[PDB]
């Protein structure tokens, strides 16, 4: 009697799970919104802005109308290598953005010390991929972490929150290229016998100079011991897979839950109802970047309902014009929604006027939400790269480009108001007294932004 | 000198062969119609109505417009497991329907006894897949079997005919969930030392309680002996494949013959000229279910020409409105054609009026065909699931849904007339005196059908 | 720590490299046009006109509208087997046409003798594939070879030039089916102890009767020695691949260079922005076959600038009507451009008039190019097969059909003028005095061509 080799792991549920971390795939939590949970872990923030800054080169006519295709190819080649390292070291990739990937090792508190060593080693091997002009910067943090899941009956989003999340970003912003920077708490919790550090000026974070373990240390055996505490590390019959999630079987109630995190156009591709290459494009869009600041952004029990309330209103406003939420994340200050008008063939006429009117609606509503202290919205319009970025087994749809960066910086450097770039102002054709021409500010990563404006709105008020 | 590994087995001919049983793939018979052949074998009928009854759940708004995709996924997950069992036990899957899969072990007469044991074991292992609310019922039969191939210059269809075919359906209809029921002849021909049975009330068919072989029996060695009589069991270099048909090489005359069994839209997908997911859908259609009853439905030499003659007329009528024949099979009573109006983007306006006019044309013509004793036609209109169901290596396009079941039951419970449901009656807008409102009958598997009608037609007559 | 198996070799750059020989893939040469280089090698010309002559059979209604699909399938089945032989024997497939594939073993001069033995053996094993009514003819040549790369900023083409290139075609034209014919120089350079030949009447080329090596010869060990001189033979970790090019990694500057050789519609498929089967079709087109004859067609330093100058003008003329250059090659006499009007959904109205006007423009301009001695252009219109022909790892878009052959023969048998077939003449509706009805000539491979015409043009002149 024959025993043919198992073949099928390419079901829709598996394809959906590529777009999500294990935190959600295996999370099994209530469908109640907001949902909050609390745990401990180590975070790795990998700054990949050296890679994503290539968007402007691939906009050149030298690329003969295949810029987007060539960009996604080269970006995924490099980003895949990072993803593989993270996954083989037992991490969970939580999110990708144009500037960063964020990864988590969730563990019981007693094991943080040893897991930090694993994550340091992983970080050093990531840097080793790129020795020899593209490099990364790594921030590490550890401690208490909160998770928030928000959404409605058809859409779900998650965030991780708290001081360790704030810390990993602060650590990464301190790093130079090639550096691994530990948060103050990470340094407090780590195994100091493993590593040599130096101080970072005006900072309690430290830089890892060397991982130099004791004479009898064996990293492979140490790692094996550490896998005891990694719930989903592929093992046994499945030790050849990068993710347990590659083994997921059809389960309609699970797929119902998971698909709510994924854009409809991505699901269309997953269902083989759209060509696999259709979402890789350089296309004109309008970015609406919404930042919500809170009295204390580390307390999920306070900021969770506020985010949910804001999200309900944002989604209703975006619905009217097929705007989408591409990403949500915590910045140093606040919770940010990266909204896009124009992307998977969702491109309405008057995209500009509508974008500004939607921004103002969002600003007005969110300003009155309990516990939201300041709302700031940046609106920028131009060509951006759109595509699924990452590895075959772990990837996400992402938007990358100067105008994304510009809208992000506008909302931080012009807090408390709705701002727009020159493309948006000029194109709207709305009367000029609906705007105010703003002072020019020098902004991180932004080379001449052009004139910027406040959207003051219809009335003098 | 290198020896790279063979790679390509994904030719169009291979893809076509997935939709067909070995009976046809390796059949090499005349292109003359009708064609009849005669042999012996064991039949397995697996009632999968417990699975296909899920259509109505996947029509829920909870499935967010991916009902069809989720349905096909979960159905193929389970049906694939059944298919694998059948194929590894050396069976030939002949046909899939919404309610059933039918499999054949063709063997010389002397080997029926031992092959029945193999098929009993297979049946028990199928039941074992599902221990722990979805289960199957299995009927087995054995004896003489006739094959009929009918069609024209561009399309071919086949059927298996005779008392063993009638028997496997009767056996399956007796079964409860989890049962394996043997036809009277199957029980007469089997190895009684292998099994313990019990009587089925008011029946000469039996239920298998246990397969309990003699103390020195070894099933793997027994099975190996039995493979001597299985012409196409994958073996040798190909013992890792589920089907020999996976090794078919390009052969234009063979492909010409095989493609005649497959719908044009399926061939479009096979030729990579249509997206692989385009045929999975919940779509409104009109089902026209035609039943032809004969004096003796076991005599292929009589019923074959009659079916051919009916088919020629059916196909001409369906052509005018892009109706398709989705399936043909033998019921307990008669030969049934499952016709569909609306499916692979074949969706004409006035689908209802035309469906009724086509049904009446078919009824009138077939009623005058020699040897056709009674014609009955059921017409029902609504949302049905359409998709390729089965395993990667053996699958068929199938239509599943309440309205398919309803049209099937109408043609059996209202014999000798053309009947239609309320959707069809109301929608046609044809004058009401073209119909007769019928008495309500309680029908198998049908919960309130709504008012039913006879299509009396244009004249009082 | 797990070590999952490398997976991804299916990047766009890899897919692009399938359409190109190693001569270009690993060529790294200047982007300056024309570019010429010089080397030595052995050439194999495999006449596959016995296969491509099947186009007319697959135009039959028996093929039910899947002629193109069935043709490409059967052609690629057989052509793949030839490709594999060539590649495992260490050859570089340079180009495919309807009539032939051309392969190269580039080696230092000292190794030509041993490489000829390898190529003879390869040729004999190719013939052995087909023992038992479809066969091939093989011509071999050896000696000095020149390469020319020409094009503009967006498109590149290459050719190999010189007496060995002229010779391999002459050798192939002498061969009967099943023959291996060596050029005079090939016979002069070969290891005569390995083979028995016979004279070819009225020719200094020879026919290989037998490869019969000395008693102690071992071909596998001989071949291993010969791989020392084969730069890109897959080896080591990659000895299971048919081409090193399967291992190419993303490299934007390399991909920029390579994509210039590939048609935009092919790149669309490569980028998963078009269905993989969309380019296999039987479609009406107009072939414009341009032949340029030179005083000496073996001197790249003379004919290179002339070809470049002609190409610049051809491309500008074709641009206006989305005509494409499908292939360029050296014939016995001259450099030929196979141009096509109508193919990857590039199908303009008045295709005929425009084709004739473009031909005349080309003729007039090229006639005045320095060093071009005679220009001849054949214009023929009808159904032709279009598709990607070859192996998964090495294939090219190709056009095949009677009208391609007819346009090719018209340009050779009616030199110095623009000629057209009856379809083109009749269809153009241009006044009849723009043409001259020509004498009928009996042409190779052409069975009744119908009336042929010269396009004299608008004025008596």
The pair phi, psi for residue B438, each rounded to 5°, is -100, 155
Nearest residue of A to residue B78, measured between CA atoms: A250
Measured distance CA(B133)–CA(C222) in Å, rounded: 67
Strand bridging mode A453-455 / A435-437: antiparallel
- The structure tokens listed for B439 are 């008495």
Subunit partners of chain B (3 or more CB pairs within 8 A): A, C
Subunit partners of chain A (3 or more CB pairs within 8 A): B, C
By the CB < 8 Å criterion, does C244 face chain B? no
Number of Cβ atoms within 10 Å of the Cβ of A224: 11
Nearest CB to B77; choose among A3, A250, A259: A250
Strand bridging mode C137-151 / C180-182: parallel
CA dihedral C416, C418, C421, C422 (to 10 degrees): -120
Bridge partners of A455, per DSSP, are: A435
Nearest residue of A to residue B57, measured between CA atoms: A252
C97 is in an annotated binding site: no
Q: What is the DSSP string of C139-161?
A: EEEEEEEEEEEEE-SS-EEEEEE
The distance in angstroms from the start CA to the end CA of chain A is: 83
**Distance (Å) of CA C202 to CA A234, B460, C199:** 72, 91, 9
- The structure tokens listed for C150 are 């020409």
| Cβ contact, residue pair B277, A256, below 8 Å | no
User: Looking at beta carbons, which pairs linking B152-158 to residues 24 or more positions away fall under 8 Å?
Assistant: B152/B33, B152/B311, B152/B312, B152/B315, B154/B260, B154/C64, B155/B260, B155/B261, B155/B315, B156/B33, B156/B257, B156/B260, B156/B261, B157/B261, B157/B311, B157/B325, B157/B328, B158/B23, B158/B24, B158/B261
Measured distance CA(A198)–CA(A182) in Å, rounded: 10
Measured distance CA(A374)–CA(A366) in Å, rounded: 9
**Distance (Å) of CA A62 to CA B21, C153, C260:** 53, 9, 11
Nearest residue of C to residue A60, measured between CA atoms: C256
Nearest residue of A to residue C9, measured between CA atoms: A77
Please name the residue that has the structure tokens 């997206």.
B275
Q: Which residues of B are annotated as a binding site for Mg(2+)?
A: 47-48, 99
Cα–chain center distance at A181: 20
Mutate to test the interface with A, among B275, B279, B386 (most CBs of A within 10 A): B275
By the CB < 8 Å criterion, does A252 face chain B? yes
Burial environment of residue A341 by CB neighbours within 10 A (0 to 12, 13 to 18, 19 or more): buried
Q: Give every CB contact of residue C113 below 8 A, 6+ residues apart in sequence.
A: C189, C190, C191
Strand bridging mode A156-161 / B418-420: unpaired
Task: Say how many residues make up chain B.
Answer: 461
Measured distance CA(A431)–CA(A437) in Å, rounded: 13
Experimental approach was: X-ray
By the CB < 8 Å criterion, does B4 face chain C? yes
By the CB < 8 Å criterion, does C1 face chain A? yes
The distance in angstroms from the start CA to the end CA of chain C is: 83
Cα–chain center distance at B331: 10
| Cβ contact, residue pair C2, A240, below 8 Å | yes
User: Looking at beta carbons, which pairs linking C109-112 to residues 24 or more positions away fall under 8 Å?
Assistant: C109/C40, C111/C226, C111/C229, C112/C40, C112/C41, C112/C42, C112/C142, C112/C143, C112/C189
Checking chain C for breaks where C and the next N are over 2.5 Å apart, the residues before them are: 132
Residues from chain B contacting residue A3 (CB–CB below 8 Å): 88
- Scanning A381-400 for CB atoms below 8 A from C yields 392
Measured distance CA(A285)–CA(A152) in Å, rounded: 25
C377 Cα to chain B: minimum distance (Å): 35
Q: Give every CB contact of residue B336 below 8 A, 6+ residues apart in sequence.
A: B289, B290, B291, B292, B328, B329, B330, B408, B411
Helices (H) and strands (E) in chain A, counts: 15, 16
By the CB < 8 Å criterion, does C459 face chain A? no
| Per-residue DSSP letter, C235 | -
C406 is in an annotated binding site: yes
| Cβ contact, residue pair A66, C4, below 8 Å | no
- The closest alpha carbon to A436, from A455, A423, A414, A418, belongs to A455
Do residues A380 and A406 touch, judged by C-beta distance below 8 A? Answer: yes
Q: What is the 3-state secondary structure (H, E, C) of B121-172?
A: HHHHHHHHHCCCCCCCEEEEEEEEEEEEEEECCCCEEEEEECHHHHHHHHHH
The pair phi, psi for residue B156, each rounded to 5°, is -130, 145
Do residues A294 and A373 touch, judged by C-beta distance below 8 A? Answer: yes
Do residues B256 and B28 touch, judged by C-beta distance below 8 A? Answer: no
| Per-residue DSSP letter, B89 | T
- The structure tokens listed for A223 are 């790692």
C136 is in an annotated binding site: no
By the CB < 8 Å criterion, does A244 face chain C? no
| Cβ contact, residue pair A2, B73, below 8 Å | no
Angle at C410 between CA C409 and CA C413, to 5 degrees: 80
Asked if the bond preceding B243 is cis, omega within 30° of 0, the reply is no
A206 Cα to chain C: minimum distance (Å): 28
Tell me the residue ranges of DSSP E strands in C61-214.
Answer: 92-96, 100-106, 137-151, 156-161, 180-182, 195-199, 206-211
By the CB < 8 Å criterion, does A267 face chain B? yes
The pair phi, psi for residue A407, each rounded to 5°, is -55, -40
Measured distance CA(A12)–CA(C100) in Å, rounded: 44
Question: What is the three-class DSSP state of A17?
Answer: helix
- The structure tokens listed for A379 are 């609106």
Measured distance CA(C101)–CA(C95) in Å, rounded: 6
Resolution reached, in Å?
A: 1.7
- The closest alpha carbon to B455, from B443, B440, B441, B428, belongs to B428
| Cβ contact, residue pair A277, C272, below 8 Å | yes
Bridge partners of C391, per DSSP, are: C394
Q: Give every CB contact of residue A32 below 8 A, 6+ residues apart in sequence.
A: none
Please name the residue that has the structure tokens 């300041």.
A374
B–C interface: beta-carbon pairs under 8 A = 61
- The closest alpha carbon to A51, from A81, A78, A87, belongs to A78
Measured distance CA(A337)–CA(A97) in Å, rounded: 12
- The closest alpha carbon to B297, from B146, B418, B91, belongs to B146
Nearest CB to A271; choose among B66, B80, B240: B66
Question: What is the three-class DSSP state of A438?
Answer: coil
Measured distance CA(B176)–CA(B137) in Å, rounded: 6
Measured distance CA(C39)–CA(C23) in Å, rounded: 11
The distance in angstroms from the start CA to the end CA of chain B is: 83
**Distance (Å) of CA A313 to CA A414, A458, B288:** 23, 21, 48
Bridge partners of A333, per DSSP, are: none
Measured distance CA(A58)–CA(A72) in Å, rounded: 10
By the CB < 8 Å criterion, does A223 face chain C? yes
Domains for chain B: give ranges and CATH numbers.
34-245 (3.30.70.1230), 278-461 (3.30.70.1230)
Asked if the bond preceding C34 is cis, omega within 30° of 0, the reply is yes
User: Looking at beta carbons, which pairs linking C398-401 to residues 24 or more positions away fall under 8 Å?
Assistant: C398/C96, C398/C97, C398/C98, C398/C326, C398/C327, C399/C98, C399/C285, C399/C287, C399/C326, C399/C338, C399/C340, C399/C343, C400/C52, C400/C55, C400/C98, C401/C55, C401/C98
- The structure tokens listed for A326 are 């591409």
Measured distance CA(A78)–CA(A80) in Å, rounded: 5
Please name the residue that has the structure tokens 């294990």.
A22
Strand bridging mode C418-420 / C372-391: parallel
**Distance (Å) of CA C221 to CA B219, C99, C210, C225, C244:** 49, 34, 20, 6, 22
CA C264, C269, C272, C278 dihedral sign is positive
Please tell me chain C's helix, strand, coil percentages from 3-state DSSP, rounded to the nearest 5. 40, 25, 35
Bridge partners of C379, per DSSP, are: C288, C420
- The closest alpha carbon to C340, from C328, C353, C356, C322, belongs to C322
Do residues A457 and A367 touch, judged by C-beta distance below 8 A? Answer: no
**Distance (Å) of CA B388 to CA B86, B148, B280, B345, C397:** 19, 24, 7, 15, 32
Strand bridging mode B92-96 / B137-151: unpaired
Q: Give every CB contact of residue B360 below 8 A, 6+ residues apart in sequence.
A: B418, B455, B457
Measured distance CA(C47)–CA(C98) in Å, rounded: 9
| Cβ contact, residue pair C8, A64, below 8 Å | no
- The closest alpha carbon to A208, from A145, A116, A144, A130, belongs to A116
H-type alpha helices, B228-378? 252-258, 264-270, 300-320, 351-367
Tell me the residue ranges of DSSP E strands in A257-393.
Answer: 281-294, 324-330, 335-341, 372-391
Residues from chain B contacting residue A11 (CB–CB below 8 Å): 73, 77
Nearest residue of C to residue B248, measured between CA atoms: C77
Bridge partners of C93, per DSSP, are: C103
**Distance (Å) of CA A318 to CA A187, A341, A357, A358:** 43, 8, 11, 7
| Cβ contact, residue pair C267, A66, below 8 Å | yes
Angle at C63 between CA C386 and CA B154, to 5 degrees: 145
Nearest CB to B73; choose among A5, A12, A260: A12
| Per-residue DSSP letter, B113 | H
| Per-residue DSSP letter, A6 | P
Tell me the residue ranges of DSSP E strands in C152-235.
Answer: 156-161, 180-182, 195-199, 206-211
Helix pair B67-88, B112-129: axis angle to 10 deg: 140
Nearest residue of B to residue C239, measured between CA atoms: B2
Q: Which residues of A are annotated as a binding site for Mg(2+)?
A: 47-48, 99
- The structure tokens listed for C183 are 């050029």
Q: Give every CB contact of residue C252 below 8 A, 6+ residues apart in sequence.
A: A58, A63, A70, A73, A74
Subunit partners of chain C (3 or more CB pairs within 8 A): A, B
């Amino acid at each position: 009697m024959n025993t043919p080799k198992e073949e099928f792991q390419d079901w829709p549920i598996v394809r959906i799970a590529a777009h999500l971390p294990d935190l959600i795939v295996y999370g099994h939590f209530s469908p109640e919104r907001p949902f909050m949970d609390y745990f401990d872990g180590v975070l790795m923030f990998v700054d990949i802005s050296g890679f994503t800054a290539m968007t402007e080169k691939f906009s050149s006519a030298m690329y003969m109308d295949r810029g987007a295709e060539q960009l996604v190819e080269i970006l995924n080649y490099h980003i895949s290598a990072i993803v593989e390292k993270v996954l083989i070291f037992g991490g969970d990739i939580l999110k990708f953005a144009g500037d960063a990937l964020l990864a988590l090792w969730r563990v019981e508190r007693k094991q943080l010390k040893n897991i930090i060593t694993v994550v340091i080693k992983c970080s050093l091997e990531i840097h080793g991929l790129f020795e020899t002009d593209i490099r990364v910067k790594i921030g590490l943090a550890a401690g208490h972490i909160s998770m928030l899941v928000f959404g409605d009956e058809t859409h779900s989003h998650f965030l991780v929150i708290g001081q360790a999340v704030d810390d990993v970003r602060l650590a990464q912003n301190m790093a130079q290229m090639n550096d691994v920077i530990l948060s103050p708490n990470c340094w407090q919790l780590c195994d100091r016998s493993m590593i040599e550090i130096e101080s970072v000026p005006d900072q309690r974070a430290v830089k890892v100079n060397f991982l130099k373990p004791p004479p009898n240390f064996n990293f492979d055996e140490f790692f094996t011991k550490c896998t005891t505490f990694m719930h989903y590390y592929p093992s046994g019959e499945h030790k050849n897979l990068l993710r347990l999630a590659c083994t997921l079987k059809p389960d309609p109630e699970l797929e119902m839950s998971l698909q709510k995190y994924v854009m409809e156009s991505i699901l269309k591709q997953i269902d083989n109802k759209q060509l696999q290459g259709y979402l890789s494009e350089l296309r004109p869009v309008t970015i609406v970047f919404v930042n919500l600041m809170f009295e204390d952004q580390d307390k999920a029990e306070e900021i969770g309902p506020a985010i949910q309330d804001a999200y309900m209103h944002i989604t209703s406003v975006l619905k009217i014009f097929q705007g989408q939420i591409n990403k949500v994340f915590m910045f140093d200050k606040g919770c940010s929604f990266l909204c896009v008008f124009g992307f998977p063939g969702e491109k309405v006429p008057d995209e500009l006027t509508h974008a500004l009117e939607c921004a103002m609606d969002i600003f007005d509503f969110c300003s009155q939400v309990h516990k939201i202290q300041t709302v700031s919205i940046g609106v920028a319009s131009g060509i951006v790269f759109c595509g699924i970025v990452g590895h075959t087994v772990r990837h996400e749809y992402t938007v990358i480009g100067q105008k994304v960066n510009l809208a992000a910086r506008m909302m931080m450097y012009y807090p408390g108001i709705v701002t727009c770039d020159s493309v948006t102002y000029n194109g709207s054709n709305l009367p000029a007294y609906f705007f105010k021409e703003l002072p020019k500010k020098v902004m991180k990563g932004v080379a001449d932004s052009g004139p910027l404006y406040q959207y003051w709105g219809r009335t003098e008020k």
